[PDB]
Design a protein around this ligand. Sequence first.
Ligand code: ZN
Ligand code: ZN
Ligand code: ZN
Ligand code: ZN
Lengths: 374, 374
Amino acid sequence: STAGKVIKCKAAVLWEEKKPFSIEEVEVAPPKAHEVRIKMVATGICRSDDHVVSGTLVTPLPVIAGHEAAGIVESIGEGVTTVRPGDKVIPLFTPQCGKCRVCKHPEGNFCLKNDLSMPRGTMQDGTSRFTCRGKPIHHFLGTSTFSQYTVVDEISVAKIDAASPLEKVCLIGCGFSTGYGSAVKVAKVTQGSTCAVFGLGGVGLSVIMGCKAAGAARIIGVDINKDKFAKAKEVGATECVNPQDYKKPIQEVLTEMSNGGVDFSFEVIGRLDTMVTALSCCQEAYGVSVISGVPPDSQNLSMNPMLLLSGRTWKGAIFGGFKSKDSVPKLVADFMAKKFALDPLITHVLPFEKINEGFDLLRSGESIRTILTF
Amino acid sequence: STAGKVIKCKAAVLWEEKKPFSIEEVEVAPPKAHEVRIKMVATGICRSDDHVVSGTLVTPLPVIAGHEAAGIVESIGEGVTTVRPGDKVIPLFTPQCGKCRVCKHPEGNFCLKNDLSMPRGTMQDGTSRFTCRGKPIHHFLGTSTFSQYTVVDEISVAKIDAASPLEKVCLIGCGFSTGYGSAVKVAKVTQGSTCAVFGLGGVGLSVIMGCKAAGAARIIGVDINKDKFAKAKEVGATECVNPQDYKKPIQEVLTEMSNGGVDFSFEVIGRLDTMVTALSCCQEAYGVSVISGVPPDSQNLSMNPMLLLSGRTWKGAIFGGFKSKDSVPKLVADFMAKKFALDPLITHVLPFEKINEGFDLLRSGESIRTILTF
Ligand SMILES: [Zn+2]
Ligand SMILES: [Zn+2]
Ligand SMILES: [Zn+2]
Ligand SMILES: [Zn+2]
């Protein structure tokens, strides 16, 4: 009874930069070829969504943001073979087309069909499925999850376990997978190793989780906010250090604590200075440092290339380095098998309509993660 | 009739920064336990030796420099098991003690017994085997090959094929191995890949040879000096580009040429700007950039971490990433098996006594490599 027809529903539209989200009645067009319309069940509030508001992550406005989410398929357009009406799904802000240079590469995941490098804010076909009072509203990262219903291209959605709790697994759409993959996929943390995680928010916690699943012997949480330590240890951190406690630079403290440098360091914060600090605190000959947060408005950092000449490896990634469509279902499966817990990351749950409160919570730093429910 | 006794011989002593090498009669003391006295047959002039002259590379003076060489063991001290009087050997400026954390790591090679990080200019026991007119002279990187005879610690020498041409395999002591390993050991260039090599001196040529051995489909030579192109092609370059020919930045032309970025890039020059350019011209999602030259006096480079966030990997290494004692013999073996050639790298050959000329040749840029002979 909705298939093939425009659906009228509510969405959170951002009409202009630096403005609160406006809950509006919007029209969601039915899926065209290879597209999938999804009824949203839950969506997380991610810092990246806030960068849009800030005009820091440039993408065309007005837009429906939101990229970390889970829902149920309402209908599919022609030619769609990977999901069916009724399936539980997670939108993939990093698509997996399967055919570009990158998707075919054993090590690449940044699919060239992405709307991140040069944001267009549309469907793959250059159009939008969203209107508010006749006016076109843009899409965001091919997902647009801050709406009761969205339409995404098939390469930007993955089918997940029919028994999954969507209020929890939605985190796999961004925050968790980013942190988790940084450790298990990008760094390739090894058993018995020593790890240093800079930034103990939601993503840093997921890094710890990855280091633990990988069997790290030591995981040193680093953060200037000691209130983050309890939860960090709770998910696997062996120790926690607050750089503000020390009279010496933190790379020194970490090098000395790890008897010469750690095996693996992670910067999840996106700070120029900590990214360099994190690089230096890894062992000079075989240490690996992984970054996962870089604000779209980043200036250039300044570092000494001698940090690299000795043997260090520096790398970054998007979405934890996971090929999205392949990985998302496996991660949910892992969750369903009770291999890792997501609850520690969820500190707040609010009905969708209270989105702006959820953003206040994000900006204040009070929450690790707010989940919005429909 | 020299074993157990002091040997009087000639060496090139550098008495003070910024002065010509002085050929002096020097006394070379007998080898103590786990030490090896070597009669030099050939040694290359490497940029890093010039850095000592310039004070770029800080190490105690007065000193006998030289770290790229080959020779024949004159005698061994007590406890030595890896080489015997009469063996052809190559000093390892990067030691392989085999017992430290780095030597035991599958990926590390910058052995913690090195005298590079904090140069002391002695044998491992903190003393020197050199005197000139009774004054002690320092060692350099535990090799000191600018002498008719040197004494090195056992962990800093490797035995090689008894049939090797020392005038040529000496290059394996530094220049060749550094470039060749950057490709085959550090980057792990794969078959059918596209590589970009910035800097076509001896080290870059060696990089090219490794890309070729690894089966690279394309190897693009980059240098502002077109007189380097012929040799680069001779050793494997499929094409050569000169940044000065273009009205746009080289990373752009390289990205366009490789249809979205190259698989592997190498900076062998040691320039802050080209290091960053090299990084940027590799594919954003799975590209790898490897540096091999960082002047001891290097400033901080400036780069945007957004280059790493997409999926790029940035690394450096000393000695081509090779575990020195294990690798050197195998490289000579490959040479002897006709796997690669060294002739193309040798442009000048001078009697040891003409060391200062060889350095003029290096400073002018007119040699790829000068080899000195005894
Ligand atoms: Zn996100
Ligand atoms: Zn793709
Ligand atoms: Zn060692
Ligand atoms: Zn050298």
